[PDB]
Amino acid sequence: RLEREQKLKLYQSATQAVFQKRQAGELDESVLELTSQILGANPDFATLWNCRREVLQHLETEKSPEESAALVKAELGFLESCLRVNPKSYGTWHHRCWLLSRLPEPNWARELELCARFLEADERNFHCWDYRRFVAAQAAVAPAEELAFTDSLITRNFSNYSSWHYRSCLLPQLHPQPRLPENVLLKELELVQNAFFTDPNDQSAWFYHRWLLGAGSGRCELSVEKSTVLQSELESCKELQELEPENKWCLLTIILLMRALDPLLYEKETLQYFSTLKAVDPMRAAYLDDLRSKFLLENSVLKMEYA
Amino acid sequence: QKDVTIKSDAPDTLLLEKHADYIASYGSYEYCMSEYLRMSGVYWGLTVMDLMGQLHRMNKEEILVFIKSCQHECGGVSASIGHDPHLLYTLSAVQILTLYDSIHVINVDKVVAYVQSLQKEDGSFAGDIWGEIDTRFSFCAVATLALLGKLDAINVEKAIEFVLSCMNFDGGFGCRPGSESHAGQIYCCTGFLAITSQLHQVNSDLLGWWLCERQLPSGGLNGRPEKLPDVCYSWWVLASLKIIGRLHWIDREKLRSFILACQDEETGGFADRPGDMVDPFHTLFGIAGLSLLGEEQIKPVSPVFCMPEEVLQRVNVQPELVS
Ligand SMILES: CN(C(=O)[C@H](Cc1cnc[nH]1)NC(=O)OCc1ccccc1)[C@@H](Cc1ccccc1)C(=O)N[C@@H](Cc1c[nH]c2ccccc12)C(=O)NO
Numbered sequence: 176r177l178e179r180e181q182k183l184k185l186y187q188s189a190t191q192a193v194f195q196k197r198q199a200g201e202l203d204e205s206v207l208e209l210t211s212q213i214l215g216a217n218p219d220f221a222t223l224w225n226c227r228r229e230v231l232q233h234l235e236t237e238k239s240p241e242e243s244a245a246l247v248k249a250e251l252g253f254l255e256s257c258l259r260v261n262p263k264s265y266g267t268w269h270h271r272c273w274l275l276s277r278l279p280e281p282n283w284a285r286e287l288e289l290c291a292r293f294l295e296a297d298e299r300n301f302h303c304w305d306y307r308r309f310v311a312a313q314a315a316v317a318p319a320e321e322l323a324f325t326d327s328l329i330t331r332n333f334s335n336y337s338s339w340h341y342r343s344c345l346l347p348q349l350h351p352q353p354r355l356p357e358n359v360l361l362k363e364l365e366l367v368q369n370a371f372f373t374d375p376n377d378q379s380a381w382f383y384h385r386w387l388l389g390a391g392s393g394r395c396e397l398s399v400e401k402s403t404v405l406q407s408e409l410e411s412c413k414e415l416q417e418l419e420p421e422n423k424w425c426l427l428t429i430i431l432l433m434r435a436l437d438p439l440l441y442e443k444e445t446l447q448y449f450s451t452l453k454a455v456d457p458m459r460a461a462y463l464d465d466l467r468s469k470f471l472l473e474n475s476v477l478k479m480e481y482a
Numbered sequence: 483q484k485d486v487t488i489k490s491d492a493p494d495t496l497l498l499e500k501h502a503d504y505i506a507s508y509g510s511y512e513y514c515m516s517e518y519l520r521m522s523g524v525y526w527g528l529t530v531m532d533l534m535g536q537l538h539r540m541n542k543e544e545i546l547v548f549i550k551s552c553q554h555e556c557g558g559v560s561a562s563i564g565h566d567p568h569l570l571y572t573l574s575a576v577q578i579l580t581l582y583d584s585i586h587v588i589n590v591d592k593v594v595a596y597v598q599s600l601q602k603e604d605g606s607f608a609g610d611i612w613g614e615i616d617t618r619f620s621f622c623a624v625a626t627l628a629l630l631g632k633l634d635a636i637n638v639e640k641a642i643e644f645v646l647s648c649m650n651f652d653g654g655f656g657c658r659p660g661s662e663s664h665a666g667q668i669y670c671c672t673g674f675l676a677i678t679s680q681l682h683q684v685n686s687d688l689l690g691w692w693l694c695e696r697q698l699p700s701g702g703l704n705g706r707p708e709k710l711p712d713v714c715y716s717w718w719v720l721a722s723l724k725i726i727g728r729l730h731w732i733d734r735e736k737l738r739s740f741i742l743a744c745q746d747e748e749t750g751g752f753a754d755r756p757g758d759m760v761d762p763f764h765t766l767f768g769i770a771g772l773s774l775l776g777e778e779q780i781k782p783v784s785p786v787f788c789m790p791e792e793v794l795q796r797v798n799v800q801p802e803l804v805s
């Protein structure tokens with residue numbers, strides 16, 4: 176308690192000191208000193224990151240190339256130390272981006288490795304994924320390399336929502352149309368199916384799978400291979416349903432598969448599965464009723480299309 | 483899987499009088515450490531007091547002077563005196579002045595010029611002169627301008643194009659193009675799309691599903707898959723659902739019980755989760771959540787602006803929602 180009273184007065188005094196120096200136009204290393212003592216514990220104090228940038232911008236004008244490189248290397252170390260303490264601060268990640276974007280010869284390979292390290296610690300850190308995308312763009316890293324990165328992350332352990340998300344963005348880049356190709360789609364279906372049969376509680380694979388089911392070319396355009404793959408998925412989900420009777424993701428996916436295969440032919444079973452799913456996932460009853468209503472309306476329209 | 487377990491002696495009734503008392507006395511260690519967001523802190527306190535019918539217990543004249551002293555020569559508003567201007571605190575300031583019907587306390591023309599100056603060629607907005615790009619700031623920009631009646635000052639079509647480029651495979655939105663979906667970002671982007679009349683471009687059934695899957699067995703909502711529930715993500719999720727006409731897709735009673743369990747019966751205020759330390763941020767979002775769920779003791783709240791609807795009716799800024 177008294178230590179907090181100590182820290183508070185130390186931050187307070189350092190803060191006043193920085194503001195005081197700022198009005199005076201004293202853009203020097205003493206400010207870097209003061210802010211380092213505040214930003215470590217309080218990285219969300221954005222005005223202090225602004226002060227550091229004003230100081231660094233000022234100092235580069237009135238110092239040698241070698242002196243400015245030294246200041247930049249000291250900044251990279253300070254930033255890394257801040258990130259280790261709080262890897263989820265917008266201000267710290269932005270300052271690192273601001274810094275790297277103005278360097279003459281930035282080492283992007285080192286930055287990609289920084290990202291790999293932080294993603295080992297927290298594979299869901301969206302600040303780090305965002306930074307990695309920034310570095311990948313700057314360094315002109317190809318989508319295929321990043322696709323390789325995501326697979327290792329997905330297979331080596333769980334916590335995969337962020338990795339699947341990244342794939343959803345990378346795949347369309349490997350096949351850019353101004354809606355994935357079927358060969359690509361079939362491979363992704365295989366990969367994601369492994370995922371949710373490895374961990375059927377992992378919601379992330381199920382969310383990505385629902386996307387892949389929509390990313391096709393249509394039910395009356397079903398190829399023999401895709402038709403067979405989806406029917407196989409359907410049977411494999413029924414298998415899982417036996418092993419995990421409380422698993423709602425597999426029940427929803429069964430409904431979605433029957434939709435993808437033949438809405439009218441599977442109408443009976445679709446309605447049966449809605450009843451089971453609502454029993455198993457009652458908090459979603461309202462959602463499921465609206466989905467069922469939408470499906471029954473689609474079916475009425477399909478039936479009226481009859482010649 | 484990851485969830486909280488609510489205990490059977492958790493509060494189960496709304497303690498409004500205690501909440502007004504808590505906010506009325508707030509700011510008489512963490513207070514001084516959060517001075518970098520003071521303007522937003524003031525907004526949270528005033529808005530929740532107004533939702534509870536208690537705004538008069540706050541100090542209007544003192545806040546109006548503080549706001550004027552936080553507007554910089556460039557037109558932007560800072561979080562506190564001597565701090566730097568930012569879109570976040572510019573919005574907060576304008577929300578406060580709207581609550582108080584005192585917009586001409588600051589220089590509106592310069593606010594408009596500041597917001598206008600932060601738009602980039604791709605339609606995005608930086609938060610300030612240092613260039614951080616985030617859909618949060620697209621929302622701050624249009625919400626600020628909407629409240630001032632000056633939405634026409636920015637490039638709206640390019641702003642729309644940028645926000646839509648942030649829409650993801652799952653129907654949600656992230657910070658920037660390619661960023662992962664997050665409830666906070668979804669709230670900002672659906673708010674943005676409500677203000678700019680573009681809700682028809684949202685896949686409401688897909689996003690609605692992603693949002694209702696945020697509800698955990700405890701009744702609380704998380705902000706993305708595999709995270710613990712929190713009384714504030716609970717708010718971003720519900721406001722987004724209301725904007726897209728899918729509020730009924732969550733279990734209202736279970737969520738209401740979770741929110742009420744986050745109250746501190748002794749001190750007043752809400753915490754992020756039951757038993758934790760309260761703060762004005764979670765007090766606002768807990769009370770705002772309860773209002774959206776139809777709590778009679780609380781004023782109707784705008785899901786777009788998180789201000790009382792009666793205030794928005796007054797300035798005639800009421801975005802049409804999906805339903
Ligand atoms: C900067 N903030 C945060 O980082 C919080 C942290 C937190 C929340 N719950 C537990 N910890 N995070 C947060 O508010 O997430 C919000 C958000 C909003 C939009 C996009 C992404 C994230 C919070 C404050 C805070 C800090 C630390 C601890 C608790 C609250 C914050 O200021 N959020 C902003 C979010 C925001 C951005 N634009 C807005 C427009 C209207 C309303 C809100 C906002 C806010 O409420 N402004 O008025």
Ligand SMILES: [Ca+2]
Pocket residue numbers: 537538539540541542
């Ligand atoms: Ca008063």
Ligand SMILES: [Zn+2]
Pocket residue numbers: 712713714715754764
């Ligand atoms: Zn919270």
